[PDB]
């Protein structure tokens, strides 16, 4: 059957992407019903970004000062509002391609698909995970701002990310669709730095369950451990602690494999403790942590014998 | 910045996916203008895939034997014909979401996006390379047959792949959109295999150029070499040979990148001979070979698809 | 005199439940006369389930390799044989609580009571219907295998289900008591998935008749339709087609109510189109389809005027 | 996995059901040791239920006036006594199938299984909640009087209900096994009425906890909130108030769940104002309130009754 990093079909998001121009500044907007959402820094010049008073900058702007283009058609702005670090433009027309949607704030370790856009036009779709330090290892160039991250569940799009900025490391920072940054980042030109990042343990454990299903079992051992002594070990190798919720989420893969969450944890403890040889697990030289348990279950579609 | 496995925006393809049912067999079809393209093995029952006479099986069916569903709405079949291993169903209605399209046959080492579909409903998109042995390392479950692969340029979708079958290895085989298999595979359940797999050298070289553009230069070697030197070492490491044709196509990635080709080859030779050992490239310990020169240029300059 | 999902009294089945252990594997067995029935996968390890050859696995096992416990008393195995996906263990003692029984294979849409058991000990009893896709929406954990489904008719138990496995959805698969799976499922660890499910129309129609008997009649209209046009409509809403047998089975509820099967069908067709303005029928927000016509007649012991 | 309204295994209760006849009146009795418990209204004739003097009616009867049948075998009555609204008939023989039992009085919102019996013969088992207004929404026909409700812990049956009568609404009234009515109801044909009705908040909350353990998590609103502002909002939707005792009892689930308490209340508030938009919880569009915390724990960990 095989196993691969897959993104959601991007079509439902493609039908919402628009271009937003304010003065000399252009980035991407999301057109849902009669609202267009983008980063509020669209109203800013590079000089404005040094000490930005967004309230003053916005009172000085009018509806006419916002050019919103949905391909060929101009959309008239009939109202402009600000919520946290995102801007909302009320327009003449409701997007007739508006999908069933939700705004959700995701947790560190959860995954979503990014549609990288420029000038309101899709370039690319890729799968990524919200890192523990509230950054994403993305692919974004100048003009990518306003690109969204999302999940699709039942023809319902859960928008979970809007792109704002790139950090020294080359990793990316943004907001949920309510304007609130992930992490301790701000939309102003000052010295910021991504905190030391950590490996998403629950995702590594799901990846190992995927490895077992696809033929690789060399790493598995007979022994088990208790939960706290694994977590102590995890801190030593910069792995996130494993919540009971994480164990509970691992339940289905445990059921199919017949390998207890705490059993898999013990095998992982020794992979990290002794280091490893030049071994590829699931055709990877390094442990992959941007697959969630639900990602692995979605693709492997195995059964449980009770 | 950043570098990620990027798929094309799938929206234009999503609008063409339909379900095709013949007897108790259902798989995916591609609805372009007033034609629906699907694997001809849709006419084959679950019991009969051993060694079928496709000509006989098709003449014994008429148009009413083909149920085509485009979401809720039934599409009337007004004609059936077979071209190579693909079935073409003429329907009374032209897909109003038909994009500007082309049918192309791709070369070993070239990349495309797969839209994994089930029951005519797109589930996922991933980027894929046609392997040297004319297989793809895909992610497919039962019901995935008729899923297509494609490239986009400007507004024009180039369909290059239709999924037909899975081999013993777990790798996948299919056709171009004219019904001709990639590799020496047949749409009958027999002992077939190609395990002539090699690493796509020209793709690895472009991936390294992408690493240079995005700030990874740790691996780089200061000295220069000759083209003969690569082929010896490459065969030992299971890497395909290189040609002046490949170098000519790499001309852009020797310009802004402004780096020599055999210098990159020397860096690969030493890293392949002994592992990078704790130092990673674009977040990966392993040389990745599913990026073409044009893939790196599109991603690093942000080309958009209207 | 209300209406509620009722299961059969479980006592006669409880007197047949035993524990079966083979090596490290334990599940439930049914003890009828001098035979104990369980899933054949009791002889399998988790590794065996990857590619199980049951014939070899069973020839290697002996009678004394099967530990059969009926509470405190050990039952000696004097013979083992396999029939389809069920294992049959002959023991030296006939269950003195053996009830009058039959093995029947039920149809999609028929209902039965499940006695969920662990370690040969009853946990619970619930009512469920065999879904059209040959799955059951059950409640089963690890160790539930060998749990049976049944109907009781005249102090005679009709066993119709034995639990084997859980699918990705969280729905359940099993066999009749001759070892033949309901649906296209196999007792192997491979990629399986439940087909898209459909609503049991004849059961929905019985539920509506129950609604009328208990006071709720708002949905009833002045008009009728013919049979095929409703069936056409049913396909649109994913409802099973209504066979003449189904009309015939609906005869008694039609007789009491004085509402023709085809009259009730028309009311359903209109509550199918535009759903309805959100409200409860028989205390339910959604159409219930795990009541059979015979279930409704059993509870609503009404009179037919002539 | 899965979640079902599950009733206790009824076998231990089935072995205690007998038929009690006085004049032309027959109903069900409970045979424990050498005592048979039944409604005292068995001594009342069809005509004389308006306002009877139970003391006078009983003194005018002797032991021979009571016919007790346990299947085919006649049980001789050697003593009759009345305790509250229950008649106790001493018989010469102890029920050899007497289980380990207890008599308990349950609180509003607690659950039990009803074994619906007719002519001393069990017909059905269902799970029931004692409603706030001290009624049960049951399924009873003529002949159902004396049917009992019960819980099981270990090998010990806790009898908590005996059915006496049906009210105008179609809901049901009865006693504990000491003859004291639940609610302000009397075994006399007068104008009496339930009237009160709330949804059992603590039970709805546990149902949501069950949904989480089984996978449904679409509904969640992952905020924190106060207990007071829930109480105000819940009364507006006619939901019972909450207590710290209730929170304390919900402590055990929170260990496995790893989930906050106030979050569920917000999710309920928004579902109560939203309709659920057609998307269901454990297969239900309506909040279900006939599951206690211990019901969810017993069902999700598979406890068994020896």
Residue numbers in the entry:
A (entry chain C), B (entry chain D), C (entry chain A), D (entry chain B): 1 to 306
Q: Mind quoting what the paper says about this structure?
A:
Mpro is a cysteine protease that cleaves at no less than 11 sites on the replicase polyproteins. Initially, Mpro releases itself from the polyproteins through autocleavage. Then the mature Mpro forms a functional homodimer and transcleaves pp1a and pp1ab. Given its essential role in the viral life cycle and the absence of closely related homologs in the human genome, Mpro is considered an attractive target for anti-CoV drug development (12–14).
We determined this crystal structure at 2.2 Å, and it showed there are two pairs of Mpro dimers (AB and A′B′) in an asymmetric unit. Similar conformation was observed in SARS-CoV Mpro, suggesting this is an important intermediate state for these two viral proteases in the cleavage cycle. This structure therefore represents the postcleavage state for SARS-CoV-2 Mpro in the processing of the nsp5|6 substrate, where the P1′ to P4′ portion has already been released. The P1 to P6 sites take on conformations similar to those in the precleavage state. The alignment of protomer A and protomer B shows that the loop connecting domains I and II serves as a hinge, which allows domain III to rotate by ∼5°.
